[model samples]
Target: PIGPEDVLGLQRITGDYLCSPEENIYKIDFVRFKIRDMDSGTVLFEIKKPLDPNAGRFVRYQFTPAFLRLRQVGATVEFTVGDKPVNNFRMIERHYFRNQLLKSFDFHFGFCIPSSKNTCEHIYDFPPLSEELISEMIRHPYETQSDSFYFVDDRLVMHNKADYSYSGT
Candidate 1:
């Protein structure tokens, strides 16, 4: 099992990779190292720090590690992977206040976080999902009405998707 030392090493590796990116490493919510022999690039493990929900300041938001079950979806909002439930995910909620009142809200990937740094080493590129899997994920009751669905590594970095954005891009 990986210990604190190993996690620290990984933190350094990610930092080095992100330093060159124009964006700052806002936070490392989670990290997904590659695992072998698993279709769907299964995530073998994950880590997250606890968050102080009461913290009123946006800057106070801290990165936390949590366990994720990649193949299941639970009581929490549901999304699907090929007709099967996918509860092993995280959510990202963006709220904006205008005139000191909540104005706009956007929610996506309530099961996983999003990555700002998108590049090699930090982001792994997988084969475009098969048509069967794409259809399955999109067919899920929860996802059918959703705007978009993405497959991300443990680090919450988006890798692939079902929809075609452009004409043969």
Candidate 2:
């Protein structure tokens, strides 16, 4: 059984891991996609946002630390988010490894508009501003910083680099 502390610790490691400043009061932010992969870019596991076009944004996202479930077969833990189907953004954590001691939680974390369909036949209709913003993130990453937050094209990008440094020096 995976202890709750273990999961909390992971979230704490990413202090204000997913947040947005509302003039002062911090607000919860959703990470659209995350890929935990091997050294060779082999995606061991990944989580993506809802592909449905109607899945709108949440006014105030919430995460319940007490409400979580654990599973066997390599330790799969889950965190609850919202009640609605479209708002049900789950935070799943998996511990899969061939050998122990070797650790690499390094992953790609960012909010992106993926294809509307699984077959990539339909593209998500990204607004002009959003389309440019996404392109900016890819074209010029970590271009600017706003208090430890990497705002590329005035957008926050959540990335767990190997060094775990966010000083944005």
Candidate 3:
């Protein structure tokens, strides 16, 4: 019953697992482990990648609490294979907030939605960059103008702060 949209959201919220730290940057890896359909206990998909020796320490990738809630509701899971590029928000202003006066922004990160008819093709094929696609991706409230698509860290916290004081009788 779970669809691609659910999986997309899960991927974004999970982010990447840090493998090791080098100099000032951290080297991370994104890999698919396993996905189980709780309703029938069916293993829908699973994949594993080789561990990199120079990649430093390893950390198991896990679903965030928000993602766990979706899983409990019977959402389908999809894990990625191999290492994917990291969304470096620290380097970009739109991706991350630098000034205290300005609230931080987070972009949703995940594989691009499929445009083809074939399931395998759609899942595996990387959508070619286009002006329309880029505009669509950037329109999301939590999105950035970066070439990469990523999940927003926490828009609710950044946008919901109240500045006015409340008086009680």
Candidate 4:
């Protein structure tokens, strides 16, 4: 059972961890998801987001081996769903491995673990932003100081002998 302390320790190791500004108040939630054999009801794997310090949970659980093989990664088995009956099984195509060792708690994505809280009453989620709203968002300033929250974009991460620093002398 990973805990909050485990995530903080990971932050120390990464050094790139960001800290919220001082005197801040916030809410913390714990969410977990599990994979199970739908017929006999056997538990296969479980993911506890707040404990994960990163996208490791996603890489381990979300994708199929075929899809993950790009180098290396939900399901319905799609066996049946009323033919295309509106395709209630839609899922994101992207992998979340960028924060594989960071806390999985994300304001934009993580929520009451889906399959578990299958108990929670379904609520209407906000629709995607309009094109104009999207355009405005894209044009808005998104600057954040290094001390701001973690924004994991592997393209921006400095791990491949690339430079995140511009001056050494």
Candidate 5:
């Protein structure tokens, strides 16, 4: 029965792992993370925070969520394993490796509060998504009858798996 208290117990451990994943480079296979809308059973967004800078960026690739329906369901979101619907972050690492789920304080919401010096306390500055223009943006795909799908694969595969690098000659 792993509850909030147990999650809290792992706070410091999770914090250090996220800060310096290379500490467990061989053991941990850092997979893409996701934010899902539980009520509607839809994945709101995808995230991939890489440990290495081999590609020149920690966040190799990411895309915004579909806002209209997401807003309809309130701003509530939960983290899940990228490809699997049933498995959470804890399941990915099993009992042997570090759990990426982390503690409550490790999670950030909305915009950054200027008072916080800690990185975990810092909220991401998401661009303002207005409710009014939601229809237009969604409609753009349907009107053309093209580019409706945001992801190339329905299984929500990681971007690194697919060879997207191209050179125009």
Candidate 6:
């Protein structure tokens, strides 16, 4: 229900009451989203915006669906979440606590304007981060491949829970 490019900020006090270092076990790192060709797995244009340095634990991105073509049903969207990108910044456990997770926008949410619609406005859809999902991501043994999502039928849907064996050391 929000504009895709609308900006917001939040102090990332991420965790339950046992939010201290020892109990704070992970970081989502950076997430990248792409519009791709289904047959060839080719990425069309991707979105990007710099993270505001002074924004605390909060980060944001833009949503411009006007660039998408409705005639292309073969356009598939996929994004991965974890500590997968290059470690260009200083980080470790509880990265947000020490502001270590800065510059890393955990990208899962956005707006998509479909060719089927007249307006550039798109619905902000996502797999509701309920207790089951939150626990699944938090308790999973691996790090980078901890979670994933897929785009389908001009809608959002949850795919299989990730169990990738290649967690970075």
TM-scores of all candidate predictions against the true structure: 0.17, 0.18, 0.21, 0.21, 0.23, 0.19
Selected candidate, larger TM-score, 3 vs 6: 3
Model 6: worst 10 consecutive residues (lDDT sum) = 86-95
lDDT of all predictions, in order shown?
0.23, 0.25, 0.26, 0.24, 0.26, 0.26
Residues 1-169, candidate 2: write the lDDT tens digits: 2222333334222322343333211123333432222223333234444463213222111212111111111212222223222211112222111111111121222332332211111111211233443343334323311112222223342222211111222
The 10 consecutive residues of candidate 4 with the worst lDDT sum are 157-166
Candidate 6's displacement at residue 77, Å, is 8.4
Off by over 4 Å in 2: 1-20, 23-31, 36-38, 51-148, 152-169
- lDDT string, candidate 1, 87-155, tens digits: 333222212111111111112243322333221122222334446544443343222111111222323
Scanning candidate 2 in windows of ten residues, the lowest lDDT window is 66-75
The alpha-carbon lDDT assigned to residue 134 of candidate 6 equals 38
Overall local distance difference test of candidate 5:
0.26
Of candidates 5 and 4, the better by lDDT: 5
Which candidate do you rate higher for lDDT, 1 or 2? Answer: 2
Which candidate do you rate higher for TM-score, 4 or 5? 5
User: Model 3 Cα displacement at 139 (Å)?
Assistant: 30
lDDT of 3 by residue, 39-76 (tens): 44655445545557524222222222222122322222
lDDT of 1 at 36: 24
C-alpha RMSD in Å of predicted model 3 compared with the true structure: 19.6
Per-residue alpha-carbon lDDT of candidate 4 for residues 1-169, written as tens digits (9 for 90 to 100): 2222333333222343233222111111125445444443444445554464432311312222222111100211111112211212211121112223211222222222332322221112222344643333234322101111221221111111001111111
lDDT of 6: 0.26
Candidate scoring better on TM-score of 1 and 6: 6
Name model 4 segments beyond 4 Å from true. Answer: 1-15, 20-24, 34-45, 48-64, 67-169
